[PDB]
Design a protein around this ligand. Sequence first.
Ligand SMILES: OC[C@H]1O[C@@H](O)[C@H](O)[C@@H](O)[C@@H]1O
Ligand code: NA
Lengths: 339, 346
Amino acid sequence: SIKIRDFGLGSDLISLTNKAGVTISFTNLGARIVDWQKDGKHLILGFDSAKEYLEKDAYPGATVGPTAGRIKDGLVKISGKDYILNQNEGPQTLHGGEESIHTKLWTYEVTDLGAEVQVKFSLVSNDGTNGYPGKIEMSVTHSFDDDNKWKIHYEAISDKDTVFNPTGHVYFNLNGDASESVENHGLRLAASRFVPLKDQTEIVRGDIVDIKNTDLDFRQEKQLSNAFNSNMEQVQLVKGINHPFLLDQLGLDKEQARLTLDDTSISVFTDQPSIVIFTANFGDLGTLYHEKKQVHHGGITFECQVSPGSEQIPELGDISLKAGEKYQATTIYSLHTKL
Amino acid sequence: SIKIRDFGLGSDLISLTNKAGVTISFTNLGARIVDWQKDGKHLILGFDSAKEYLEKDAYPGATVGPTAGRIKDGLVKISGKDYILNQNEGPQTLHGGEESIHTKLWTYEVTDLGAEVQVKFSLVSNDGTNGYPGKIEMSVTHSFDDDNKWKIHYEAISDKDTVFNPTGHVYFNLNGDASESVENHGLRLAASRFVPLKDQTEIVRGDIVDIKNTDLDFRQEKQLSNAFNSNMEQVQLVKGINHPFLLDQLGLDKEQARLTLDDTSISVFTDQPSIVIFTANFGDLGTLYHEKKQVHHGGITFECQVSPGSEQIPELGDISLKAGEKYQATTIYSLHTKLEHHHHHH
Ligand SMILES: OC[C@H]1O[C@@H](O)[C@H](O)[C@@H](O)[C@@H]1O
Ligand code: NA
């Protein structure tokens, strides 16, 4: 079934309940995922109204871009030309700059296919918006089906050469409670390398490091506490994890990662080359979710996209988008319950 | 009372009924007025869903900006610097460029004051959007009261020195039918001069002309047909009216314009210096409004703002906005009955 309701400030809340009784909800504010629940338990983090997002934290579950992550000095070069983007974190351009697409009301249309329901959100990024050449017509399709597969499909077209590399910012918490650390969760991840950060500014350091046999090797399922109790300078630098992991094998068919807690597991699939993992290293902040004080490590993201830092490490890839070219991306979060 | 419902594509329809039974409605898509009715008659032009606006004509009743009208070659000078804005009408920048504010979903909050209800829509124009320095935090408050006054209040603040001169794009048609020309309406307008357009591109000519005693003089109420039937060059150039009228006496207190049809009048008050009037000179385009094919001259706007062309005619004004300086503009449309005797035949 589908239900639509006012989410606050003119935003809407779209909730889909599949054949299994599983419920997922989104909002046009930032084309984002608001909740995901089973047997009355939430699997991800989210607020209860639009205002909260706006007052507390605008990132959770949002579509971020046009470029996800940090860009050193807000500088990108397009067609051999230097362009300076909005700087919203020191000299860096983080998640597209201030007041980005995650804070806009996107238009949308719901398409019911029976076993699957789709919600297509659309937004036009005007040429010059936050320094980015455009215009960029974008759409993000969130769909949910009877197999408990939540999928995100992106598309974009620009009138001019530009840069484009958005991501989905859902935070998972299989504990179903923000006051509870995800350290008890088990993680498996098909990445043998990672991108170290320079320093507390969180810009990339400049190199690619092999994680094989370190506290960050999750090629074999392991509990998070491990990584969390590590003395790796990199873990110590951010106070948990806040890094791009390079997937070993590319392709939407491969389970790139798996988050498990008890009989509940989330599998991640993407056509992207990297997964940025952030463990809600907020320390004492205590943001409130469902009236629950958030704890350091009370959440974890799987941001699938091209690794940030390509400006300095070209090997990472290239986020350019040429005029007329159609950008496409897909990421899937599949839910499974053991028997 | 207040009612809200989905209007399509994610936009909402906010409907107000005052104590007099008059209803009016708005949508967050372009912080725009959708309808205004009296005794079941539409006083304005509007569509029935959000998709219509996007598919047929996105301007009607919208809030347009950041700069209303045409900027020759999309060129503005901001604090000694030249800036080139999005050019969406040939080399011209018309109504802030492509996919401007009128096309966006604004957030909004409703404030019930009893005899008055306010709908405050908000949006942020990011720095550099369509070439405009920002960011610009904007808000438009549409309000309706028990006295039948519909008021629009604009507010804005920029992080950088920029330009700002927005307007409301409502179209009136007292016939309550798009297929009926407004040439049968009576018009009174407190303006002695107007700004002629150079040619079909519609940029300003460069001069200010005195229209007293011409077919464009409405200081004393006259039927619109007088204008429509005129062969004055300017009328012929645009096939009707599509010009800025320089108000003679400024001030929010003065009735600058009055549009009448029989027993109904719409009075216009504003704190702006000019009123740009466009009479839906669409020829046989025939856009469908409520299943009625719109006729040439099947509507009229009163866009209150600083006149367009100040780039070329400095005398018109200064639409610049200094960083940190707060912009405000107020326009009011008031509805009356039997204000005067208007008994004609066309
Ligand atoms: O689409 C509506 C537009 O039509 C043009 O002919 C007018 O000059 C514009 O001012 C008006 O907003
Ligand atoms: Na809504």
